[PDB]
Scaffold this motif. Structure first.
Motif, PDB file in Angstrom:
ATOM      1  N   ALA A   1      24.892  74.011  47.066  1.00 37.14           N
ATOM      2  CA  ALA A   1      24.420  72.385  47.695  1.00 37.14           C
ATOM      3  C   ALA A   1      24.590  71.138  46.469  1.00 37.14           C
ATOM      4  O   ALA A   1      23.997  70.366  46.470  1.00 37.14           O
ATOM      5  N   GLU A   2      25.501  71.658  45.728  1.00 38.43           N
ATOM      6  CA  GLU A   2      25.788  70.639  44.408  1.00 38.43           C
ATOM      7  C   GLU A   2      26.221  69.293  45.245  1.00 38.43           C
ATOM      8  O   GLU A   2      25.765  68.142  44.275  1.00 38.43           O
ATOM      9  N   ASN A   3      26.877  69.200  46.384  1.00 37.56           N
ATOM     10  CA  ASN A   3      27.499  67.902  46.914  1.00 37.56           C
ATOM     11  C   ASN A   3      26.537  67.610  47.985  1.00 37.56           C
ATOM     12  O   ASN A   3      26.755  66.574  48.758  1.00 37.56           O
ATOM     13  N   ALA A   4      25.325  68.098  48.259  1.00 40.18           N
ATOM     14  CA  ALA A   4      24.429  67.794  49.358  1.00 40.18           C
ATOM     15  C   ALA A   4      23.872  66.509  49.212  1.00 40.18           C
ATOM     16  O   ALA A   4      23.551  66.137  48.142  1.00 40.18           O
ATOM     17  N   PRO A   5      23.649  65.539  50.171  1.00 38.30           N
ATOM     18  CA  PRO A   5      23.312  64.409  50.197  1.00 38.30           C
ATOM     19  C   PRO A   5      21.556  64.466  49.677  1.00 38.30           C
ATOM     20  O   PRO A   5      20.875  65.322  50.457  1.00 38.30           O
TER      21      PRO A   5
ATOM     22  N   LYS B   1       9.107  56.526  37.391  1.00 39.73           N
ATOM     23  CA  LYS B   1       9.521  57.344  36.212  1.00 39.73           C
ATOM     24  C   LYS B   1       9.574  58.896  37.009  1.00 39.73           C
ATOM     25  O   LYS B   1      10.329  59.613  36.707  1.00 39.73           O
ATOM     26  N   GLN B   2       8.341  59.156  37.448  1.00 36.60           N
ATOM     27  CA  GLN B   2       8.027  60.312  38.021  1.00 36.60           C
ATOM     28  C   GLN B   2       9.326  60.702  38.899  1.00 36.60           C
ATOM     29  O   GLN B   2      10.014  61.693  38.797  1.00 36.60           O
ATOM     30  N   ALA B   3       9.487  59.703  39.992  1.00 38.73           N
ATOM     31  CA  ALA B   3      10.720  59.754  40.809  1.00 38.73           C
ATOM     32  C   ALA B   3      11.767  59.569  39.945  1.00 38.73           C
ATOM     33  O   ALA B   3      11.484  58.945  38.793  1.00 38.73           O
ATOM     34  N   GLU B   4      13.106  59.731  40.080  1.00 35.70           N
ATOM     35  CA  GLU B   4      13.918  59.374  38.863  1.00 35.70           C
ATOM     36  C   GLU B   4      14.148  60.578  37.995  1.00 35.70           C
ATOM     37  O   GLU B   4      14.977  60.661  37.209  1.00 35.70           O
ATOM     38  N   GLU B   5      12.927  61.298  37.850  1.00 39.66           N
ATOM     39  CA  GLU B   5      12.666  62.585  36.831  1.00 39.66           C
ATOM     40  C   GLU B   5      13.002  63.541  37.663  1.00 39.66           C
ATOM     41  O   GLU B   5      13.566  64.530  37.488  1.00 39.66           O
ATOM     42  N   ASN B   6      12.369  63.413  38.894  1.00 42.05           N
ATOM     43  CA  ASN B   6      12.217  64.538  39.993  1.00 42.05           C
ATOM     44  C   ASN B   6      13.474  64.507  40.460  1.00 42.05           C
ATOM     45  O   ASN B   6      14.313  65.610  40.769  1.00 42.05           O
ATOM     46  N   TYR B   7      14.379  63.384  40.585  1.00 35.19           N
ATOM     47  CA  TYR B   7      15.500  63.312  41.183  1.00 35.19           C
ATOM     48  C   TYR B   7      16.763  63.741  40.282  1.00 35.19           C
ATOM     49  O   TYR B   7      17.595  64.550  40.794  1.00 35.19           O
ATOM     50  N   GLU B   8      16.444  63.915  39.066  1.00 34.68           N
ATOM     51  CA  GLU B   8      17.262  64.439  38.251  1.00 34.68           C
ATOM     52  C   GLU B   8      17.362  65.841  38.072  1.00 34.68           C
ATOM     53  O   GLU B   8      18.129  66.601  37.880  1.00 34.68           O
TER      54      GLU B   8
ATOM     55  N   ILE C   1      16.237  67.501  40.540  1.00 37.52           N
ATOM     56  CA  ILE C   1      17.047  68.077  41.778  1.00 37.52           C
ATOM     57  C   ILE C   1      18.448  68.279  41.536  1.00 37.52           C
ATOM     58  O   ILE C   1      19.253  69.402  41.954  1.00 37.52           O
ATOM     59  N   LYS C   2      19.073  67.173  40.882  1.00 37.91           N
ATOM     60  CA  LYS C   2      20.696  67.230  40.692  1.00 37.91           C
ATOM     61  C   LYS C   2      21.103  68.226  39.649  1.00 37.91           C
ATOM     62  O   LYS C   2      22.020  68.843  39.856  1.00 37.91           O
ATOM     63  N   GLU C   3      20.140  68.563  38.800  1.00 42.68           N
ATOM     64  CA  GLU C   3      20.127  69.705  37.828  1.00 42.68           C
ATOM     65  C   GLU C   3      20.104  71.145  38.610  1.00 42.68           C
ATOM     66  O   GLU C   3      21.039  71.925  38.578  1.00 42.68           O
ATOM     67  N   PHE C   4      19.033  71.274  39.414  1.00 39.47           N
ATOM     68  CA  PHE C   4      18.629  72.367  40.042  1.00 39.47           C
ATOM     69  C   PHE C   4      19.554  72.833  41.007  1.00 39.47           C
ATOM     70  O   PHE C   4      19.982  74.203  40.980  1.00 39.47           O
ATOM     71  N   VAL C   5      20.296  71.819  41.606  1.00 41.61           N
ATOM     72  CA  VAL C   5      21.489  72.010  42.379  1.00 41.61           C
ATOM     73  C   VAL C   5      23.000  72.272  41.902  1.00 41.61           C
ATOM     74  O   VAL C   5      23.877  72.745  42.621  1.00 41.61           O
ATOM     75  N   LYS C   6      23.190  71.731  40.668  1.00 38.90           N
ATOM     76  CA  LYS C   6      24.339  71.928  40.128  1.00 38.90           C
ATOM     77  C   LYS C   6      24.854  73.260  39.628  1.00 38.90           C
ATOM     78  O   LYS C   6      23.982  74.310  39.471  1.00 38.90           O
ATOM     79  N   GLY C   7      26.035  73.558  40.242  1.00 35.56           N
ATOM     80  CA  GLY C   7      26.643  74.830  40.131  1.00 35.56           C
ATOM     81  C   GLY C   7      26.447  75.755  41.414  1.00 35.56           C
ATOM     82  O   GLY C   7      26.630  76.742  41.522  1.00 35.56           O
TER      83      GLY C   7
ATOM     84  N   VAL D   1      16.239  66.770  51.083  1.00 39.36           N
ATOM     85  CA  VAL D   1      15.202  65.726  51.280  1.00 39.36           C
ATOM     86  C   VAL D   1      14.233  65.577  50.384  1.00 39.36           C
ATOM     87  O   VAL D   1      13.413  66.627  49.974  1.00 39.36           O
ATOM     88  N   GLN D   2      14.189  64.627  49.536  1.00 40.30           N
ATOM     89  CA  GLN D   2      13.068  64.345  48.304  1.00 40.30           C
ATOM     90  C   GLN D   2      12.006  63.571  49.113  1.00 40.30           C
ATOM     91  O   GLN D   2      11.770  62.595  49.248  1.00 40.30           O
ATOM     92  N   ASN D   3      10.960  64.432  49.569  1.00 40.75           N
ATOM     93  CA  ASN D   3       9.916  64.217  50.309  1.00 40.75           C
ATOM     94  C   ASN D   3       8.761  63.458  49.110  1.00 40.75           C
ATOM     95  O   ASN D   3       8.613  63.569  48.044  1.00 40.75           O
ATOM     96  N   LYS D   4       7.704  62.804  49.891  1.00 38.04           N
ATOM     97  CA  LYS D   4       6.539  62.203  49.052  1.00 38.04           C
ATOM     98  C   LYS D   4       6.821  61.322  48.088  1.00 38.04           C
ATOM     99  O   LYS D   4       6.205  61.217  46.921  1.00 38.04           O
ATOM    100  N   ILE D   5       7.903  60.460  47.845  1.00 37.36           N
ATOM    101  CA  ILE D   5       8.422  59.568  47.237  1.00 37.36           C
ATOM    102  C   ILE D   5       7.223  58.291  47.136  1.00 37.36           C
ATOM    103  O   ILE D   5       7.426  57.720  46.054  1.00 37.36           O
ATOM    104  N   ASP D   6       6.676  58.243  48.314  1.00 36.42           N
ATOM    105  CA  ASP D   6       5.670  57.423  48.116  1.00 36.42           C
ATOM    106  C   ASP D   6       4.608  57.396  47.070  1.00 36.42           C
ATOM    107  O   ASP D   6       4.190  56.627  46.425  1.00 36.42           O
TER     108      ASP D   6
END
Ligand SMILES: [Zn+2]
Length: 391
Positions: A158-162, A140-147, A149-155, A130-135
């Motif tokens: 939880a690499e495939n977690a929603p 740009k902050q979001a989308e940067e935070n999102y990437e 997250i995808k980096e952090f979990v890669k490998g 869950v990516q909280n506090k998107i509000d």
């Protein structure tokens, strides 16, 4: 219906898992690193009409009678160290988890990385992110935070977690889709961890009105039925003749409950209130925490010494030097969590990743059971590793 699954609420203590727990359950999440389990139940309902998911008896967007689907239980701990220890000891009996990550902060936050490591070590792959506090923050902050997250979990596990940017409807749906109830064996040998115990009698209650002590059970496997005669391993210390050994407590299951829901049977999932025949003084204020319950004669052996295989945790939370990686050494005094039990111990022999440890307090455990390891890293206890009992 009782809770069918245990779901861990993990992530940095300030990223939002605490408020999220309250919203889904109405429950306020609240000298050694003890095991202190925090449970919070959530009944997922749906509306035949609008198909909205909710915890409410009547619809949020059409005031129609909702339908019951499944009951789940969230597991949390007082703090970071305790939560990590609770998972590595096997006390939490997680089937899945929700990892909460705030968008207004770098991502990987230490605590956050550490929780993912425990999920991996535990082989827990039913994860919802869950990516909280998107509000807060912008596009740009979001989308940067999102990437991040995808980096952090890669490998990782939880690499495939929603990844869900956060609404109660979307989360309940996801819990149902990504964390299904696991298949269990109805006939496995009934075993249970005592996570809590109490004296539910108010002051001045008449003696003939007294009720048996109550146990807070976390069922590991099997089914417990009301009426079952049970045995409480480690029991208590007694001095008969010229001895003083540890004597097991035998009692009977007088009642079972999932929160305020009465049950006749009880299986793994959530915390089960177990009414017994035991005199109140033996259970008051979690007196029996860390005990193991099972049918007479079926409990694992009692150990006062053990041999474990230990792994050093590659921690990132803590200062410096405090973050150092130090191997176990002979003569060291450690604090261990195994199951819901907590006991000091001293190493009588360190041989690589293997150590013989003499415990201050007896333990009821099976070969292969998990162990959380801590050492006095200064003025407090600090979790430095985890492992299993191999002897
Ligand atoms: Zn509806």
């Amino acid at each position: 219906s009782q809770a069918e699954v245990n779901i861990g609420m993990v992530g940095h203590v300030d990223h939002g898992k605490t408020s999220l727990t309250k919203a889904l359950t109405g429950v306020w999440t609240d000298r050694g690193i003890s095991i202190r389990l925090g449970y919070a139940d959530c009944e997922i309902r749906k509306c035949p009409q609008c198909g909205t998911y909710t915890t409410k008896p009547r619809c949020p967007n059409c005031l129609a009678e909702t339908e019951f689907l499944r009951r789940v239980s969230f597991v949390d701990s007082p703090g970071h160290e305790t939560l990590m220890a609770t998972m590595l000891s096997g006390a939490s009996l997680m089937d899945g988890a929700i990892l909460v990550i705030a968008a207004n902060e770098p991502c990987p936050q230490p605590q956050t990385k550490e929780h993912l490591m425990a999920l991996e070590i535990l082989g827990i792959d039913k994860i919802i992110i869950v990516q909280n506090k998107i509000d807060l923050v912008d596009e740009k902050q979001a989308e940067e935070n999102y990437e991040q997250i995808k980096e952090f979990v890669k490998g990782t596990i939880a690499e495939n977690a929603p990844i869900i940017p956060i609404n109660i409807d979307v989360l309940l749906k996801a819990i149902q889709d990504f964390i299904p109830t696991p298949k269990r064996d109805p006939d496995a040998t009934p075993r249970m961890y005592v996570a809590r115990s109490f004296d539910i009698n108010k002051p001045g209650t008449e003696i003939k009105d007294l009720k048996g002590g109550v146990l807070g059970g976390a069922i590991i496997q099997g089914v417990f039925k009301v009426g079952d005669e049970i045995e409480i391993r480690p029991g208590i210390k007694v001095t008969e003749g010229n001895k003083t050994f540890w004597k097991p407590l035998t009692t009977k299951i007088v009642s079972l409950a999932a929160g305020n829901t009465i049950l006749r049977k009880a299986h793994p999932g959530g915390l089960i209130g177990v009414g017994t025949t035991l005199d109140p003084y033996l259970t008051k204020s979690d007196a029996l925490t860390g005990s193991v319950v099972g049918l007479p004669g079926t409990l694992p052996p009692i150990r006062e010494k053990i041999t474990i295989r230990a792994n050093l945790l590659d921690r990132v939370v803590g200062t410096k030097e405090e973050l150092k990686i130090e191997p176990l050494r002979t003569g060291e005094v450690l604090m261990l969590n195994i199951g819901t039990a907590t006991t000091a111990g001293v190493i009588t022999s360190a041989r690589g990743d293997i150590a013989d440890i003499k415990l201050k307090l007896p333990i009821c455990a099976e070969i292969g059971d998990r162990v959380a390891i801590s050492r006095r890293v200064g003025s407090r206890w600090r979790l430095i590793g985890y492992g299993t009992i191999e002897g």
